[PDB]
RNA sequence: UUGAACAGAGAGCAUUUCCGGCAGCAGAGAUUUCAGCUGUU
C-alpha cells in the first residue's frame, strides 16, 4: 500500500537569507480564481474613480502674459519646448516652457500680429546657425512680414543679433502666415495669397482665387507642396505648389477659422468652423467630411492636431477647449477656467503630452493632454499597474455606472444652459423635419456629413 | 514577475523535450524546480555571483545529459529541434544577466568570454566583439583585457589591423605599463617575422624595406622608453637627480629584459636590433653622462656588446677572428674604464668566454681551443 | 497555438459579418483567446508540488482498511505532527473552522469555550470562556476577526479576543458564514431569517425570510457566493441578497435536510437527509447524480475535499468516498463490493471515533488533512489526496507574513464585490440585458421600428387576424374579448369584436355551404 | 489594518472594522466600565426598562395637559421612580423623558451604593467585597452585585458582623469589643 | 545634386551559394577535444 501525502519543504516557501524576497507559488487553474467578470469589473470601476480623483489637467502658465489678447501662438517643429506667442499689441514673445519664461520680447508691429510661424530660413549666400539661434516670421496689418532672430541657450558649443533681420513689405495687410516645410518659401494671407521667398523683397507668386480675402492658411506637414487657406466668403481652398495654382474651392453653410493637417496622413485636414463644430476632410473627395466634432458651443475658433494624429483639439468662444479622438464625433475631456475668456489658439505640444492656450485675456496656458497621467518616469510596476488599468477600463467602458462616471465633468453654467437651449431647438428642428416628412411621400435623407457643405468647384 | 516571465520563457524547450522522447514530464518537472530555485534566487535581492556560476553549472550538465539521453534513445547525434542550441541560449543569457549586474568579478567576465569562444560554430565574431567592447569600456585600465583582445583577433582571424588598433587603443589607456609595451613589441616581430617568412616561403615555391629590418619595433621601443620615464617620474613626483638615476635604472632593466626578447627572436636581425638600443644607451640621458651615472651599468652594457658579437654565432662554429676583434674591444674598454672596472669586466669577459667555448671544446679536441685557453689566462 | 491535454479547464464559454474592421477585430480576439488560452494551460509545468494518494498494491489490500496510525508511521513526521488531537473533555461538543489559509484554527464548545490558535505552530491567539452556549464561529476576512453564533446574538470579536461588535440584528443564529471576496458574513438560525452583513463598513446588507422554519443546514458555494440552505421541509434553497425569494428550490430529501456540502469548482452539491439519503446532484443543470438510499444511521455531516473527496460523518463514523462527484452510475458511493466487483464504488476511507459523536467536518485547506470537531476536541486525521498541493500565493498564502496580510487586507478592501453582483451564473456581469434586443439597432433601423409602430395601428396588425380555420373555441379574437374587461368599452374592443363577428360569419357560411 | 494612503481612503471613506452604526458608539460598553457591570444584557435588559419609561411618558404627553388621569400618572410615575431612587427629583415631568438613562439606574447597583457610602475605594473592590461575603442589606447577606438599592433600604446596608473588614475599622478606631463578636 | 576612391559600423534587408550527414587523413589544444583537409552521401 503506497502512502504518499503532500509534503512542503520549507526551502521552496520560505527563504533562509533573510534579504531574499519570498517565493509566489502561482497556479492558473480557474477553480482558485473565483468572479473573474466581476473582479474586473471592480478593478476597471476603481481606475475610473481614480481617474476622476487624479484628473488636474492645469500646468501652468507662461510668464505673466502679454498685455493684450494672444491672438498668434506658433510652435517650434523642431525644438520640444519652444514657442511663440504674439498679441493684439504688436508684442511677441518667445517662451521656453520648461522654465516658463521668455528668451525676449520684440515690439514687432503697430498693429495687430495676426500671424505668427517659426522658419529655418535658408539663404543662398550664407547658413544661419540653427543651434545658437532660431528665426520667427510674423506678418500684421502695418503691411509688414517681418522676420526675426532669437539667441538660444540649448547648446554650450561654443562661448550675435536678436531683433530684425529683414523686412518683407506689402501692398495691403496680411491676416495669416505659414512657412513650407522643407524649403525657405512661406505664404501670408489678406487680401490675396502670396508666395514669398526669404531671399527676395517681394513676392514670388500670387495664388489668389478670385477677388476674396483669405483668413487662414496652413501648409501640408507630409506633402509639403500642398497649402490650403481660408476665406471670408465661407470657402476652403487648396493648393498645390508643382502645378503653382489653386487646386479646389469649397463653399460651405460658415465660414471656417483655422485648419490643420494630419501629421500621420497627407491627405487629412480638420477645420474648425462658425458652426459651433469641427469638420473633418480628406483631400480627394470634398464632397462629404469624414467626421463631425459637435460638442462646442459657440464659434470654434483654433485646432490642431496630436502630433500621433489620434486626437485634435479644439480652442472655442465659448471660453472652452475640447479634446476629440479621431474615431468619435464628440469629445473625450473639456478644458475651463473662470480666469480663461475667449480662446483664439490652442497648440498641441511635439511631445504630444501638453496643450499650449491662448486667451482673451493674454494668458498663456499649458494643460495636460490627459488630466490623469504624470510627468514622472514610472517603474516597472506601476507601468504594469497603469497599463492594466487602462485596457480595463476599455474593456468595461460600455457599462452603465463606468460610463456615469466616466463622461461626468464640472461645466460652466452659461455653457450648460446654452447645451440645453441647443438641445431644445434641435428637438424642435426633429419634429419639424418629421412634419415635412410626414407631408411630402418622398423626402431625401441627407447626411449629418453632408449638411454643412454647400458646394465644391469641380464636380465629382 | 520577472521570475515567471523568465520559467514561461524557458517553457518551449521542455513541449519539445517532451515532444520528442528524451525526457519523462515528471523528469521535465523536477528540472523545472531547480529552474525555479535558480531564478527566484537571480532575480530576488541578495544575489551573489555565484549563485549565477551555479546555475551555469546546473545548466551545463543538463545540457550533458540531453546530450547523453539524445544518444541512447533516438541513436542520433542531435534532433534538429529547438532543445539543442536552447540551453546554450540559456547558459549565455545567464552569463549577459551576470556581467550586466556586477560587472567588477574579472573571473565571471572571463567565464562568459571562455564559453562563447568554446562554442565556436555556433556562435558570432560579432558577439565576441561586442563583449570585448563591453568589457573594454568598463575596464580599460586593466592591460590584460587589452591584450586578450588583441591575442583573440591575431590568433583566430589574423586581423593584423585591428591587433595593432587595439595595441594602440590600449597604451593610450595604459602609457605606464611596461607590459603592453612589450606585447605590442611582440606582436610587431611576429608580424615582420610573419611577413619576411611568407617571402621566403613565396621564394621556394616559384621556379632592403625598413618594415622587414625592424624599425617599427625600434620606434615603439624609443616612445616605450621617453613615455616610461616620464610616467615613472610622475609616480615618485640632488634629490631630484638621485630620483633620475632611479628611474635611468629601472628603464635599463626593461632594456634589457626587451634584449632578452631580441634574443628569443633568432630569424630577426639580432644584431641590428642590440645595434640599435646600444646607440640608445650610448645616448645620454636625463641630463646625466650614462657611463659617469652608472659605471656598473655601461661596464655591463660594454661587456654585453662584446659577448654579443660573437654569441649569436655557434661556440662550435665559432670564428676566431671575431674572437679576437671582441678580445680587442674588451681591452680597448678595459683601457677606457678604470682599473677595477677593468678588471671587473675581464673577469666577467672571461667568464663569459669560458662558458662559451671552454666547456663545449677541449685543448685537445681543438687546437684554436689551446689559443683560446692562453687568452683566458692571459685576460 | 499547439493543443494541449489540460486545456479543457482553461477553456471559457460563451453565450460571417461584411464589415471589415469588424471582421479583422473579432480575428483578433479569437487568436488572443486561443493563444490566451494555451499559454495558460502551458503553465502546468510549474506546479511546484503533486497531489498525494493511497494506492493498494494488492487484491487484498483494501484502502478503507488502513488504520490512522499506520498512516502516521508510514508518512513523514511534519504531516505526522499536522495530525494532532485535543482532549478537551468538559465544554463539548467542539464546532471546528479552519482559516482559508488553513494556517488557523477556531474551535467552539457548546458550553462556552472558544479558542483560536495557530495550530501548526502551536500559538493561542486567544481563548474565551463566555459561560453561554455557543452554536459555531468563523473566521473573516483574516486570522485577525472571528465572529461566534452565541446564546442569542452574535458577536465579533478580535485577535487578542475582545469583543468589538454584538449584533443585536442576528437573533439566534446557528449557522455563520463569510464570504471572502464580498466581505459578507452570513448568518441563519432559528428564526428562519438569512442576514448578510457587511463587515467592513458595517450595514446589514440583506434580510431574507426563508418562510420554512428553522434552517437545518446551511453552505455557500465558493464559486459563485449562492448561500444553500437546508429546511426541515426536505428542500435545499438558493439564496442571492438583492432577491428576496430563493433563485432556486430543489426537493432533496424527504425529512430534514440534515447537511450540505458543495464542491470548489461550485458544479457538484451533496446532501444529507434524516431519512437515512445522501444526494449527490449537478449544480449548474440542477439534476441529481446519486441518490444513496439507506444509510445505516442517518449522515450528520458531509465535507467535500478541494480535491474531490466527499467525506460522510455520521455518528461515530467518518467515511470518505473517491471519485464520488461524477456523472456515471459506477461513481455511486456504496459500502461493499459485492465478489469485488470493480463498477462498485467502496469507501475511500474509515475512521471509528468510539463512544464519541462526530460534531462537524472541516478539510484543511491545502494539506492532507480532515479536521474532525467531536465531544471530547478535535482530531485530525490523515487522508493522501484530499488537499491542493498547489496554491496560487495571490490568493491565499499559507506562509504569509505580517505586512504581506496587512496588505492583501486593503487590496481585498479595495476590490471587494458588490453583494448585488451575486447571481447564479458568475458569468453575468457585461452581459447585454435580456429585454434588449440581440442586434444593434442604428437610428435609421430605430426609425423603421417606430414607423411600423405607427402604422401598426392603421393596418390593423395589433389585434389578431380572422382565422376561419381555427373554431371559435380556441379563438384568439375570442380570448381577447373575454380578457378585456366587460364594463370599459375601447375602440380596440370594438374593432376585435367586428373581426370576430366577421369570422365567425364566415365560419357559419362554411359550414353551412359544407353542409 | 494599516493606515490607509491618501488614495485608498477616498475609495474606503466607509471602511471601519471597530465602530459600527449599530455599536451606538460603545455607549453600553462605556457604562458598564464606569460602573463595573459583569453582566452583557445588563444594560440591555436596563434600556429597555428605560424604554418603557420613555413610551409611557411619551403617551402622558400626547393626553391634553388639564387631564386628572394624566396628572395622576405623571405623579405617580414620578414617585415611583423617585422612592427607587432613579430620579434625583420629583420636580419637573420632562425628567421622566430627560433624566431617565441606563446610568440612574446602574448607579443603584450595591457597590455604587457602598462606594457612594464610602465603604469601598472603588466600585471594583466593592464588587469584589459583595462576592466575598462581607455585605448584607438587613440581617440578609447579599453575594450579587446587581442587586437594586432602594432609597428606603439603603439605610441598612451594613458590613456582616465577624467581617475581617469591620474588625479592621474597629481596630483602627480602638474601639473593638470582642464581646461583641466585633 | 551626383559620381569615384578610401575607411568603416554590426546596425538593417535578401540569398534559388555553402556548412551544421558519414568515412578517412593530418594538425593543434587541454587520453579526449578542436576546427581543417581529402572523399562519399
Known amino acids: 500500500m503506497k502512502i504518499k501525502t503532500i509534503k512542503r519543504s520549507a526551502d521552496d516557501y520560505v527563504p533562509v537569507k533573510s534579504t ?152 495691403s495687410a496680411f491676416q495669416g502666415i505659414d512657412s513650407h516645410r522643407e524649403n525657405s518659401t512661406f505664404a501670408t494671407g489678406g487680401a490675396k495669397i502670396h508666395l514669398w521667398d526669404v531671399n527676395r523683397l517681394k513676392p514670388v507668386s500670387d495664388l489668389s482665387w478670385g477677388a476674396d480675402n483669405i483668413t487662414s492658411l496652413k501648409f501640408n506637414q507630409n506633402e509639403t507642396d500642398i497649402l490650403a487657406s481660408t476665406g471670408s466668403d465661407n470657402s476652403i481652398v487648396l493648393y498645390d505648389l508643382r502645378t503653382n495654382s489653386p487646386t479646389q474651392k469649397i463653399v460651405q453653410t460658415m465660414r471656417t477659422n483655422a485648419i490643420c493637417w494630419n501629421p500621420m496622413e497627407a491627405f487629412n485636414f480638420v477645420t474648425a468652423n462658425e458652426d459651433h463644430n469641427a469638420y473633418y476632410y480628406d483631400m480627394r473627395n470634398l464632397s462629404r467630411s469624414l467626421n463631425v466634432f459637435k460638442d462646442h458651443v459657440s464659434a470654434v475658433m483654433d485646432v490642431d492636431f496630436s502630433p500621433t494624429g489620434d486626437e485634435i483639439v479644439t480652442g472655442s468662444y465659448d471660453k472652452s477647449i475640447r479634446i476629440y479622438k479621431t474615431n468619435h464625433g464628440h469629445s473625450r475631456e473639456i478644458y475651463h477656467t473662470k480666469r480663461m475668456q475667449h480662446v483664439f489658439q490652442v497648440k498641441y505640444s511635439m511631445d504630444s503630452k501638453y496643450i499650449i492656450s491662448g486667451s482673451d485675456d493674454g494668458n498663456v496656458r499649458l494643460w495636460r493632454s490627459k488630466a490623469w497621467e504624470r510627468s514622472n518616469v514610472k517603474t516597472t510596476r506601476e507601468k504594469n499597474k497603469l497599463e492594466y488599468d487602462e485596457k480595463l477600463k476599455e474593456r468595461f467602458r460600455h457599462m452603465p455606472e463606468i460610463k456615469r462616471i466616466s463622461r461626468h465633468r464640472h461645466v460652466p453654467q452659461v455653457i450648460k444652459k446654452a447645451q440645453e437651449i441647443k438641445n431644445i431647438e434641435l428637438s424642435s428642428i426633429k419634429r419639424r423635419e418629421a412634419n415635412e416628412r410626414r407631408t411630402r411621400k418622398d423626402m431625401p435623407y441627407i447626411s449629418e456629413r453632408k449638411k454643412q457643405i454647400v458646394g465644391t468647384v469641380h464636380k465629382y | ?239 631630484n637627480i638621485e630620483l633620475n638615476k632611479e628611474t635611468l635604472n629601472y628603464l635599463f632593466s626593461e632594456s634589457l629584459r626587451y634584449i632578452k626578447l631580441f634574443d628569443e627572436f633568432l630569424d630577426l636581425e639580432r644584431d641590428y636590433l642590440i645595434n640599435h638600443v646600444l646607440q640608445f644607451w650610448k645616448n645620454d640621458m636625463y641630463d646625466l653622462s650614462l657611463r659617469k651615472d652608472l659605471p656598473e651599468l655601461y661596464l655591463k652594457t660594454v661587456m654585453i656588446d662584446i659577448t654579443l658579437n660573437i654569441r649569436y654565432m655557434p661556440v662550435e662554429k665559432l670564428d676566431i677572428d671575431q674572437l679576437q676583434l671582441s678580445v680587442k674591444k674588451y681591452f680597448a674598454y678595459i683601457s677606457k674604464l678604470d682599473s677595477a672596472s677593468v678588471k671587473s669586466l675581464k673577469n666577467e669577459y672571461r667568464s663569459y668566454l669560458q662558458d662559451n667555448y671552454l666547456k663545449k671544446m677541449n685543448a685537445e679536441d681543438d687546437p684554436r681551443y689551446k689559443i683560446l685557453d692562453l687568452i683566458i689566462s692571459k685576460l | 497555438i499547439k493543443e494541449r491535454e489540460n486545456q479543457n479547464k482553461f477553456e471559457r464559454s460563451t453565450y460571417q459579418t461584411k464589415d471589415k474592421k469588424l ?31 493511497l494506492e493498494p498494491e494488492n487484491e487484498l489490500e483494501k484502502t478503507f482498511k488502513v488504520q490512522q496510525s499506520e498512516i502516521k508511521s508510514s508518512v513523514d513526521v511534519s504531516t505526522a505532527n499536522k495530525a494532532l488531537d485535543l482532549s478537551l473533555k468538559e465544554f463539548g461538543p467542539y464546532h471546528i473552522k479552519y482559516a482559508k489559509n488553513g494556517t488557523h484554527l477556531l474551535i467552539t464548545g457548546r458550553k462556552g469555550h472558544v479558542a483560536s490558535m495557530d495550530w501548526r505552530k502551536g500559538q493561542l491567539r486567544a481563548e474565551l470562556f463566555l459561560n453561554e452556549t455557543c452554536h459555531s464561529a468563523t473566521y473573516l476576512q483574516n486570522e485577525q476577526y472571528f465572529a461566534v453564533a452565541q446564546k442569542k446574538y452574535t458577536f465579533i470579536y478580535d485577535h487578542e479576543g475582545t469583543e468589538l461588535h454584538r449584533l443585536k440584528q442576528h437573533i439566534e443564529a446557528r449557522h455563520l458564514d463569510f464570504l471572502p471576496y464580498h466581505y459578507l458574513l452570513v448568518t441563519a438560525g432559528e428564526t428562519g431569517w438569512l442576514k448578510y452583513h457587511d463587515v467592513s463598513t458595517g450595514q446589514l446588507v440583506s434580510e431574507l425570510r426563508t418562510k420554512a422554519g428553522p434552517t437545518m443546514a446551511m453552505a455557500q458555494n465558493p464559486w459563485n457566493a449562492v448561500m444553500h440552505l437546508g429546511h426541515s421541509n426536505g428542500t435545499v434553497s438558493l439564496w442571492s441578497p438583492s432577491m428576496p425569494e430563493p433563485l432556486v428550490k430543489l426537493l432533496s430529501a424527504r425529512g430534514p435536510v440534515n447537511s450540505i456540502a458543495i464542491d470548489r469548482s461550485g458544479y457538484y452539491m451533496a446532501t444529507t437527509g434524516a431519512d437515512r439519503s445522501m444526494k449527490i446532484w449537478d449544480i449548474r443543470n440542477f439534476k441529481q447524480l446519486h441518490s444513496v438510499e439507506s444509510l445505516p444511521t442517518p449522515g450528520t455531516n458531509v465535507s467535500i475535499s478541494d480535491t474531490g473527496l466527499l467525506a460522510l460523518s455520521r455518528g461515530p463514523h467518518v467515511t470518505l468516498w473517491k471519485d464520488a462527484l461524477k456523472l456515471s452510475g459506477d461513481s455511486k458511493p456504496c459500502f461493499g463490493s459485492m465478489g469485488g466487483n470493480p463498477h462498485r464504488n467502496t469507501p475511500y476511507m474509515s475512521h471509528l471515533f468510539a463512544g464519541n459523536k462526530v460534531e462537524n467536518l472541516g478539510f484543511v ?151 | 489594518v494599516r493606515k490607509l494612503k491618501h488614495h485608498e481612503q477616498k475609495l474606503l471613506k466607509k471602511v471601519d472594522f471597530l465602530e459600527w452604526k449599530q455599536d451606538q458608539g460603545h455607549r453600553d460598553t462605556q457604562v458598564m466600565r464606569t460602573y463595573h457591570i459583569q453582566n452583557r444584557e445588563d444594560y440591555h435588559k436596563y434600556n429597555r426598562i428605560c424604554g418603557d419609561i420613555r413610551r409611557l411618558a411619551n403617551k402622558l404627553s400626547l393626553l391634553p395637559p388639564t387631564d386628572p388621569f394624566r396628572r395622576k400618572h405623571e405623579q405617580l410615575l414620578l414617585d415611583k421612580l423617585y422612592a427607587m431612587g432613579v430620579l434625583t427629583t420629583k420636580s419637573k415631568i420632562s425628567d421622566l423623558e430627560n433624566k431617565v438613562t441606563v446610568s440612574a439606574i446602574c448607579r443603584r447597583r450595591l457597590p455604587v451604593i457602598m462606594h457612594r457610602l464610602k465603604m469601598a475605594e472603588t466600585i471594583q473592590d466593592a464588587v469584589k467585597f459583595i462576592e466575598q461575603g462581607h455585605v448584607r442589606v438587613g440581617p440578609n447577606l447579599i453575594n450579587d452585585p446587581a442587586y437594586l438599592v432602594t432609597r428606603n433600604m439603603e439605610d441598612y446596608v451594613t458590613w456582616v458582623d465577624n467581617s475581617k473588614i469591620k474588625k479592621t475599622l474597629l481596630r483602627y478606631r480602638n474601639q473593638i469589643d470582642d464581646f461583641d463578636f466585633s
Open chain 1, 20 to 171: 531574499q524576497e519570498s517565493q509566489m507559488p502561482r497556479n492558473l487553474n480557474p477553480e482558485l480564481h473565483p468572479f473573474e467578470r466581476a473582479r474586473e469589473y471592480t478593478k476597471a470601476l476603481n481606475a475610473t474613480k481614480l481617474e476622476r480623483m487624479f484628473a488636474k489637467p492645469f500646468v501652468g502658465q507662461l510668464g505673466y502674459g502679454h498685455r493684450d489678447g494672444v491672438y498668434a501662438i506658433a510652435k517650434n517643429y523642431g525644438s520640444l519646448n519652444k514657442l511663440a506667442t504674439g498679441s493684439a499689441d504688436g508684442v511677441i514673445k518667445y517662451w521656453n516652457m520648461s522654465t516658463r519664461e521668455e528668451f525676449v520680447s520684440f515690439k514687432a508691429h503697430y498693429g495687430l500680429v495676426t500671424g505668427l510661424c517659426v522658419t529655418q530660413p535658408r539663404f543662398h549666400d550664407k547658413k544661419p546657425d540653427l543651434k545658437s539661434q532660431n528665426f520667427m516670421l510674423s506678418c500684421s496689418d502695418d503691411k509688414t512680414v517681418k522676420l526675426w532672430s532669437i539667441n538660444v541657450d540649448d547648446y554650450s558649443n561654443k562661448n550675435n543679433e536678436e531683433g530684425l533681420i529683414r523686412t518683407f513689405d506689402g501692398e
Open chain 2, 1 to 239: 514577475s520577472k521570475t515567471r516571465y523568465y520559467l514561461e520563457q524557458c517553457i518551449p524547450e521542455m513541449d519539445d523535450l517532451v515532444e520528442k522522447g528524451l525526457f519523462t514530464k515528471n523528469e521535465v518537472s523536477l528540472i523545472m524546480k531547480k529552474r525555479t530555485d535558480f531564478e527566484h534566487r537571480l532575480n530576488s535581492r541578495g544575489s551573489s555571483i555565484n549563485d549565477y556560476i551555479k546555475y551555469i553549472n546546473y545548466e551545463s550538465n543538463v545540457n550533458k545529459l540531453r546530450a547523453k539521453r539524445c544518444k541512447r534513445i533516438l541513436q542520433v547525434k542531435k534532433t534538429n529541434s529547438l532543445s539543442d542550441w536552447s540551453i546554450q541560449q540559456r547558459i549565455g543569457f545567464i552569463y549577459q544577466r551576470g556581467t550586466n549586474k556586477f560587472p567588477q568579478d574579472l573571473k565571471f567576465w572571463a567565464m562568459y568570454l571562455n564559453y562563447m569562444k568554446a562554442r565556436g560554430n555556433q556562435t558570432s565574431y560579432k558577439k565576441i566583439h561586442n563583449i570585448y567592447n563591453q568589457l573594454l569600456k568598463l575596464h580599460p585600465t586593466n592591460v590584460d583585457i587589452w591584450i586578450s583582445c588583441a591575442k583573440y583577433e591575431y590568433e583566430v582571424h589574423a586581423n593584423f589591423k585591428s591587433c595593432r588598433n587595439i595595441f594602440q587603443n590600449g597604451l593610450r589607456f595604459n602609457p605606464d605599463v611596461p607590459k603592453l609595451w612589450y606585447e605590442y613589441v611582440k606582436f610587431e616581430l611576429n608580424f615582420i617575422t610573419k611577413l619576411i617568412n611568407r617571402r621566403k616561403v613565396m621564394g621556394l615555391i616559384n621556379e632592403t624595406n625598413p618594415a622587414l629590418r625592424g624599425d617599427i619595433a625600434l620606434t615603439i621601443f624609443d616612445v616605450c622608453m621617453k613615455t616610461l620615464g616620464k610616467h615613472y617620474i610622475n609616480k615618485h613626483k640632488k634629490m
Open chain 3, 23 to 53: 471582421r479583422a477585430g473579432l480575428k483578433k480576439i479569437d487568436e488572443q483567446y486561443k493563444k490566451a488560452v494555451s499559454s495558460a494551460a502551458a503553465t502546468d509545468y510549474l506546479l511546484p508540488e503533486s497531489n498525494g494518494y
Open chain 3, 365 to 515: 485547506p491545502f494539506e492532507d488533512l480532515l479536521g474532525v470537531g467531536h465531544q471530547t476536541g478535535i482530531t485530525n486525521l490523515i487522508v493522501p489526496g484530499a488537499g491542493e498541493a498547489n496554491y496560487d500565493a495571490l490568493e491565499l498564502n499559507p506562509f504569509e507574513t505580517k505586512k504581506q496580510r496587512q496588505e492583501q487586507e486593503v487590496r481585498t478592501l479595495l476590490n471587494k464585490l458588490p453583494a448585488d453582483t451575486i447571481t447564479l451564473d458568475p458569468n453575468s456581469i457585461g452581459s447585454v440585458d435580456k429585454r434588449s434586443s440581440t442586434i444593434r439597432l442604428n437610428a435609421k433601423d430605430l426609425a423603421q421600428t417606430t414607423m411600423d409602430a405607427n402604422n401598426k395601428a392603421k393596418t390593423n396588425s395589433d389585434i389578431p387576424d380572422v382565422k376561419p380555420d381555427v373554431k371559435g373555441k380556441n379563438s384568439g379574437l375570442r380570448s381577447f374579448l373575454r380578457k378585456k374587461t366587460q364594463n370599459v368599452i375601447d375602440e380596440r374592443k370594438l374593432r376585435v369584436q367586428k373581426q370576430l363577428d366577421k369570422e365567425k360569419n364566415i365560419r357559419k357560411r362554411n359550414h353551412q355551404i359544407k353542409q
